[PDB]
From Swiss-Prot, chains A, B:
A motif (Conserved undecapeptide) lies at residues 425-435. It holds the Pfam family Thiol_cytolysin. InterPro entries: Thiol_cytolys_C (IPR035390), Thiol_cytolys_C_sf (IPR038700), Thiol_cytolysin (IPR001869), Thiol_cytolysin_ab_sf (IPR036363), Thiol_cytolysin_sf (IPR036359). A cholesterol-dependent toxin that causes cytolysis by forming pores in cholesterol-containing host membranes. After binding to target membranes, the protein assembles into a pre-pore complex. A major conformational change leads to insertion in the host membrane and formation of an oligomeric pore complex. Cholesterol is required for binding to host cell membranes, membrane insertion and pore formation; cholesterol binding is mediated by a Thr-Leu pair in the C-terminus. Can be reversibly inactivated by oxidation. Its main location: secreted. The gene is pfo. Keywords: Cytolysis, Hemolysis, Host cell membrane, Host membrane, Lipid-binding, Membrane, Secreted, Signal, Toxin, Transmembrane, Transmembrane beta strand, Virulence. This is Perfringolysin O. It comes from Clostridium perfringens (strain 13 / Type A). The record marks A426 as: Important for cholesterol binding.
């Protein structure tokens, strides 16, 4: 009891740079490189351990709980604050001045709130908006201050730290299948278009005592959870608006996925490429709007990104005759009046992959001579340590006499490498001393390697073509 | 002294599939992935161990020692054979029939040689060639049977095994720098155009005794080196002709060097690709013609592959009047008349690389507003175990006011990844609540990334371009 509200808050000992800590997995076990056969394709998956360390100050608000966050609100810097379910500190308060950042208000934009509470501070904000609606009675619809963030998805913990959003808000709203992402079954990118209408700020106190009524004692605050493990915070600024989350999803395992997606967003000229056309045919785009101005559980799901663009643009403007809801805030530690950052630290497995596809070597011999072929290749596999293991393969028809007309096909698995095709006119003793009619090395694995041999013994001809 | 030649030779117990064997080196140990800085470039080298086994029957001949090899010559299957300096087995001989595979010579290509020695067989081969110049007195030149081989170079042992040449024969003639090749300071590729004029055969005996004069004993043989460690062989065929080796050299560490070289040899219009022209600027091409016709130590070293094609097309034929030089031969074991194969096995470190160049971010602010920026990137580096290590870097000017006209450059090292450039228009309380003028993620590293911001406070403009 020998403690005042100022000396008590001052006597709290905590690391301001680590109280609001968020830690994730570190991580699990994984093979650095893995070959997989699926469909008529071979996928290869490289993996790397990645470490993130963001220390943001803008903190997401979950709509379900916005009653808890409002300018001049008082919360505790505990693990619940980090989970976006803050513990409120409800006590008898001294008045506080709040200030809205809207245009044409330099000026006559602030207001004193005698009892800072959700209802009173909301009423105060609504009145500042009604004071703006008068004066600017023609233009009631304004543009939003848009911010853009983009990120490929690797884990629930990683995308949460990249986009600064609660992962369940992402998982429930957009429908994110984190196991397909981990298994490299799906590749997903998420966009966020944060649409800020305005921000309301609360004047900071000279000393913490300026927030609490004289009757309130440090022991009253200790009863409500104020501790070294739960220091007190004041909500300094709150941003009102909405956010639009976009999900680009694909079953494709190609290396060009992130590029293809980035092209679609900017609407660039690589977009038309046939490489990206197969990626887009197996892609789905999903957009949702979160805040309050949009109706709960709204959603667009399409294979036409022009539908997504429309949703983004349609929500770039807000009406000053409708109520705005908080989307994020910045809080300040009462002890030093310093901005409270949430120190995120997480490890994750960045997956990268490459798609290969089954191929075949078609042979045609219309030549007026006996020919023999030597077709050979390797098949790549990967051991537990991610190292390549080349199992050599050969065609069963090698070194066997063929005459006009002869045709065959030599299927190759998607994991075929180092292909080599050779043909020799059999005019003589043995293979070893014959003329090469065609002789190709490290042939690329295409869907059809059309090798033809023709002509006479004096003018033999050949060619190698691809489809 | 208790046995004849036949039973003596039969009494020899050796693994025919291993008595003639060559083994390469097993190591050195290596870092699987390494990042290297070379001027305005950052090179990444991925290393894979590769085992390689061949069992060829056509063995090379070193000109310096071509007198030890001729149809019907006896040699010992010891380690000197595998090093292309065979041990001759010189004893009193019975006659032998030899046949030449020159065209239109069915039932008239043979000749008996009473004392098969280098001089007498050479003489009989010359006799056959003069006898052919009488019967085909019009056509005094013929086309050579070309065999084409190609391979990138990784180690002395590997390229020797890939192209079936004595390492020193390439190392002397072409001038391969194996230490540069192994430190990825150069990428080299070698082509071999084995051109066969003709082959001469020796008829196989029903039993070993049919080769030896009756005065010869198995003790006489044993004394001349015959053992289970040195079983006796007979040269069954010898190929006469020439070989053109071609070296394609580069300082470029680009992943497209193999493709560029192939494009050049094939003569496709892909060679005109400016990507490949930067590679051919830092390339050298060399060609040598190891054959009887072409004068000793002859050589072309150019930067125009048409000078190399000239050498090839120029050597397409051979004159029948000119003597021919032995280039290759097949031997047979006297114990079973089975063709002797050299069992080659070799491990090698296959090196593969990519090139990254330095770049810079060019910021230009001409807009009618204060702007702040957030430029950041990661620098890729590889540890002892070849795993990536990203060190986060950020521009010192981040989060500082800038008014028109503001210009700057942010140089980026060639190992720069995950480049993110953001500019926000400064109207509101702080950074966290300002609208994006530009917001780019995972920007590709280019020599110049031009970020321009312009316009007014209420309608800003921007672009990002590359060079």
């Amino acid at each position: 009891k020998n403690q005042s509200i100022d000396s008590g808050i001052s006597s709290l000992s905590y690391n301001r740079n680590e109280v609001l800590a968020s830690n994730g997995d570190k991580i699990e076990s994984f093979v650095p490189k893995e070959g997989k056969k699926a469909g008529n394709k071979f996928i290869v998956v490289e993996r790397q351990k990645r470490s993130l360390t963001t220390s943001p100050v803008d903190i997401s608000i979950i709509d379900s709980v916005n009653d808890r966050t409002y300018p001049g609100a008082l919360q505790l810097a505990d693990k619940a604050f980090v989970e976006n379910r803050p513990t409120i500190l409800m006590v008898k308060r001294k008045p506080i001045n709040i200030n809205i950042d809207l245009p044409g208000l330099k000026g006559e934009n602030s207001i004193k709130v005698d009892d800072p509470t959700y209802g009173k501070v909301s009423g105060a904000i609504d009145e500042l908006v009604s004071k703006w609606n008068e004066k600017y009675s023609s233009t009631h619809t304004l543009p939003a201050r848009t911010q853009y963030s983009e990120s490929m998805v690797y884990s629930k913990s990683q995308i949460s730290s990249a986009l600064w959003v609660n992962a369940k808000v992402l998982e429930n709203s957009l429908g994110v299948d984190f196991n397909a992402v981990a298994n490299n079954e799906k590749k997903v990118m998420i966009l966020a278009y944060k649409q800020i209408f305005y921000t309301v700020s609360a004047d900071l106190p000279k000393n913490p005592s300026d927030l609490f009524d004289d009757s309130v004692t440090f022991n009253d605050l200790k009863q409500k959870g104020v501790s070294n493990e739960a220091p007190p915070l004041m909500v300094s600024n709150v941003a009102y608006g909405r956010t639009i989350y976009v999900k680009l999803e694909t079953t494709s395992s190609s290396k060009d996925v992130q590029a293809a997606f980035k092209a679609l967003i900017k609407n660039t000229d690589i977009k038309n490429s046939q490489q990206y056309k197969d990626i887009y045919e197996n892609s789905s785009f999903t957009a949702v709007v979160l805040g309050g101005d949009a109706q709960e559980h709204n959603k667009v799901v399409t294979k036409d990104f022009d539908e997504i663009r429309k949703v983004i643009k349609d929500n770039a403007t807000f009406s000053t005759k409708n109520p705005a809801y908080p989307i994020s805030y910045t809080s300040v530690f009462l002890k030093d009046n310093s901005v409270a950052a949430v120190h995120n630290k997480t490890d994750y497995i960045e997956t990268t992959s490459t798609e290969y596809s089954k191929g075949k070597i078609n042979l045609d011999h219309s030549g007026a001579y006996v020919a023999q072929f030597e077709v050979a290749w390797d098949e790549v596999s990967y051991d537990k340590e991610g190292n390549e293991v080349l199992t050599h393969k050969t065609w069963d028809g090698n070194y066997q006499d063929k005459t006009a007309h002869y045709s065959t096909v030599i299927p190759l698995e998607a994991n075929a490498r180092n292909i080599r095709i050779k043909a020799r006119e059999a005019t003589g003793l043995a293979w070893e001393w014959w003329r090469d009619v065609i002789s190709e090395y490290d042939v690329p694995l295409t869907n059809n390697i059309n090798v033809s041999i023709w002509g006479t013994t004096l003018y033999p001809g050949s060619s190698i073509t691809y489809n």
